[PDB]
Amino acid sequence: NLYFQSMSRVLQAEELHEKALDPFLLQAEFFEIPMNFVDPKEYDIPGLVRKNRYKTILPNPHSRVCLTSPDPDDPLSSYINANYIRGYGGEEKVYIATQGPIVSTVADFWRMVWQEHTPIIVMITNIEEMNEKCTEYWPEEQVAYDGVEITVQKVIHTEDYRLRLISLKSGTEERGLKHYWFTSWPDQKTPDRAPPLLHLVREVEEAAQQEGPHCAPIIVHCSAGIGRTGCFIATSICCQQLRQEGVVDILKTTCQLRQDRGGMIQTCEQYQFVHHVMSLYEKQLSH
Numbered sequence: 001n002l003y004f005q006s007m008s009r010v011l012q013a014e015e016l017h018e019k020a021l022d023p024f025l026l027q028a029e030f031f032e033i034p035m036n037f038v039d040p041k042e043y044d045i046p047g048l049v050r051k052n053r054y055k056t057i058l059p060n061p062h063s064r065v066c067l068t069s070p071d072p073d074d075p076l077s078s079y080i081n082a083n084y085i086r087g088y089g090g091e092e093k094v095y096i097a098t099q100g101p102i103v104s105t106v107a108d109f110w111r112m113v114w115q116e117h118t119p120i121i122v123m124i125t126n127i128e129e130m131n132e133k134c135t136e137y138w139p140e141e142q143v144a145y146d147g148v149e150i151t152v153q154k155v156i157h158t159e160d161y162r163l164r165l166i167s168l169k170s171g172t173e174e175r176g177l178k179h180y181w182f183t184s185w186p187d188q189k190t191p192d193r194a195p196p197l198l199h200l201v202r203e204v205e206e207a208a209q210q211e212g213p214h215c216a217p218i219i220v221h222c223s224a225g226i227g228r229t230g231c232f233i234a235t236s237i238c239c240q241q242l243r244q245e246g247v248v249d250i251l252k253t254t255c256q257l258r259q260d261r262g263g264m265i266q267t268c269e270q271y272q273f274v275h276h277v278m279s280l281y282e283k284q285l286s287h
């Protein structure tokens, strides 16, 4: 309740099932959630226009990811359109929500990856949306940006994603990175389109567990880094909530998301989709 009054609607199984199929209650609830967008005039940085895909979708200042290398005192060099996102139970920095890199922000995105020790990237962009919704920021094989050698070591093709196993080398230190490019994001967010997003959420949460204690932030991106990104993150949080608590609170999870980054879960169709995803998971867990 720091940036706005949070809301909550704790759903047990039966109500969750019905709620996902009630678009009139969904839209009534959704359009009461504050967007918590940033006034664009909050950022008065010469050259900032080149860093943002959309002039009105800006990172909230309190949770903004600051690029501290090579100059933390230069407002432009330290800027990236990204925010630290709290996970389940308010765990700090479980994710980073960011826009899909553009030509002028490819090297900045890798600076963020390196600064944050990011082990996993979740890219929610369809094949046909390249390169207008996301610039291809990974190399075909190898590339070096600001002293970091980025190498794509393997491309694992699945039905709903392309997984790239990447190496990051600077000086003597070498780190691994998992890049999950999800290619099945639906235009029509019907229940039959919920299984590929659920599989991705479950794959990524098992991969984040395999990193061991205090997993570094997981980077999630789509075009503006709010809509599809908000859905992925809300689904991931509620999946942990349902297993731990036996209930889901998409409403309170959406409020938690909007407090960290304005516009997280941009549309009502996305809001309803998260309910289709959680209702399905609940049925699957029941067995």
Ligand SMILES: O=P(O)(O)[C@H](O)c1ccc(-c2cccc([C@@H](O)c3ccc(Cl)c(Cl)c3)c2)cc1
Binding pocket: 126, 128, 129, 183, 184, 185, 186, 187, 188, 193, 227, 228, 267, 270
């Ligand atoms: O969620 P948003 O961003 O607010 C918006 O609703 C939206 C906008 C565009 C798409 C999209 C883009 C390219 C191809 C396909 C399309 O060919 C397609 C690709 C994969 C699947 Cl799974 C489907 Cl069902 C359809 C769809 C999807 C969702």
